[PDB]
Antibody
Framework: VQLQESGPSLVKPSQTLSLTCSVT????????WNWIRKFPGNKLEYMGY???????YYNLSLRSRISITRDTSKNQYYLQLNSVTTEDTATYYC????????????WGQGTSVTVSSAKTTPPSVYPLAPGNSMVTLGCLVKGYFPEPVTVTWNSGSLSSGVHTFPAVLQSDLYTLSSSVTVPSSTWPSETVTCNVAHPASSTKVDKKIVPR | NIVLTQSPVSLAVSLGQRATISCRAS??????????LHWFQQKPGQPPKLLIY???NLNSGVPARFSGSGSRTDFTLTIDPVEADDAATYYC?????????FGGGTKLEIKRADAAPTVSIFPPSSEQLTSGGASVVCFLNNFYPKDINVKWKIDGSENGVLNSWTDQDSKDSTYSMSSTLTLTKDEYERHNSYTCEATHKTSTSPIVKSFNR
């Protein structure tokens, strides 16, 4: 029904990486409960499962590095990955296989983990205001680590005209920007705000795009 | 061992026309009168959506422009007719032979008519100037095709730039690009006019946005 991954988005080399999947509204004694990874290069890797009996299955190469455990009570299952290396950077997903399909049908949103000995830096957020019927505004999200950052406009109510660009690393820090395009009579006739989040550094920022 | 191998690596299909993507398996994925080969769509920023299960059954909620044929080591996902939401990477998955794998993906790109970019330039915020820095930003938005170039010119003259590109838009099939020049509050304050120039297939000549400090 519903899956949510959670855990540190930044783990240091040689430490154990540890994630939790949370299942809302159907029992983890009903199916096969999987972890899958996606690398920065974009290839996918199946990691393993715990079946509803507490029976586990591991990608052979991860056999000795990987644990999958459950808590029958919490309706949540865990991934432990030892002795982590830079090549364990990936966005990690939990996902479900029902008897209905025998395929991987229910997917958590994924959670980025970066394995790196660099240090969390929160972002700076700067409003991007003009110096036509359509108008274009932006937000600059500068100087953070590690990924990810989410960005929304007016809590997600504004969404159609939006470009959020992928981050770019330079000198160990990321920068990213986001553009939004509205009728030039729904601003500044109506407020428009960007909502940046950088969970890693627990930052949550609203910025009103102010004219001039 | 098994290995799944998709083909082609990438294709470009016109709105309305046919996409076909192959997945060959190393060895049969069959079991109990069933092919344990499943299809997936993945977009940047989100997880893979189950497309087709057991080779040929469409998953609940999924359009019907999407069809899956094939049997043993030989499978085909067909998207007919292609719409704009389909730009994405497609993966086949096998989960019946040790060990489970995905294919290397196929990148579906939609084709559409050439389109010129909306360009906009933004002075640095005062927030950023409160602190030591000054960033100037150009958005080059909603252009086709992806290829494009940017030049920064200060008081007329052409370090400090960082470029990012979106993936193909899922409603109008455009690409966009962001560019941001970075400087010190003192070096930016030493000049007046600031300019980015976008050049693209669509016009012989560059689109030009500018302002004076």
């Amino acid at each position: 029904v519903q899956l949510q991954e959670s855990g540190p988005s930044l783990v240091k080399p040689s430490q154990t990486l540890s994630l939790t999947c949370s299942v809302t509204g159907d029992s983890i004694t009903s199916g096969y409960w999987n972890w899958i990874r996606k690398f920065p290069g974009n290839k996918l890797e199946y990691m393993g499962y715990i079946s509803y009996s507490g029976s586990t299955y591991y990608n052979l190469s991860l056999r000795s590095r990987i644990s999958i455990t459950r808590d029958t009570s919490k309706n949540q299952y865990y991934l432990q990955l030892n002795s982590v290396t830079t090549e364990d950077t990936a966005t990690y997903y939990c996902a479900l296989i029902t008897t209905t399909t025998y395929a991987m049908d229910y997917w958590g949103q994924g959670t980025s983990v970066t394995v790196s000995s660099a240090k969390t830096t929160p972002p700076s957020v700067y409003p991007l205001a003009p110096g036509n019927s359509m108008v274009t505004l932006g937000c600059l999200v500068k100087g953070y680590f590690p990924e990810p950052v989410t960005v929304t406009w007016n809590s997600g109510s504004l969404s159609s005209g939006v470009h959020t660009f992928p981050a770019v690393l330079q000198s160990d820090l990321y920068t990213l920007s986001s553009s939004v395009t509205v009728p030039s009579s729904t601003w500044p006739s109506e407020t428009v705000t960007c909502n940046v989040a950088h969970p890693a550094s627990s930052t949550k920022v609203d910025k009103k795009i102010v004219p001039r | 061992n098994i290995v799944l191998t998709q083909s082609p690596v990438s294709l470009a299909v016109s709105l309305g026309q046919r996409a076909t993507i192959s997945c060959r398996a190393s060895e049969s994925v069959d079991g109990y009168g069933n092919s344990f080969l499943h299809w997936f769509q993945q977009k940047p920023g989100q997880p893979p959506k189950l497309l087709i299960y057991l080779a040929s059954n469409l998953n609940s909620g999924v359009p019907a422009r999407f069809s899956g044929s094939g049997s043993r080591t030989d499978f085909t996902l067909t998207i007919d007719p292609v719409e704009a939401d389909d730009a994405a990477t497609y993966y086949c998955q096998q989960n019946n032979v040790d060990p489970w794998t995905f294919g290397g993906g196929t990148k579906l790109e939609i084709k559409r008519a050439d389109a010129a970019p909306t360009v906009s330039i933004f002075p640095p915020s005062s927030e950023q100037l409160t602190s030591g820095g000054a960033s100037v930003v150009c958005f080059l938005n909603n252009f086709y095709p992806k290829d494009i170039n940017v030049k920064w010119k200060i008081d007329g003259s052409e370090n400090g730039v960082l470029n990012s590109w979106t993936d193909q838009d899922s409603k109008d099939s455009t690409y966009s690009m962001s560019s941001t020049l970075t400087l010190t509050k003192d070096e930016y304050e030493r000049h007046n006019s600031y300019t980015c120039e976008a050049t693209h297939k669509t016009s012989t000549s560059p689109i030009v946005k500018s302002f004076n400090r």
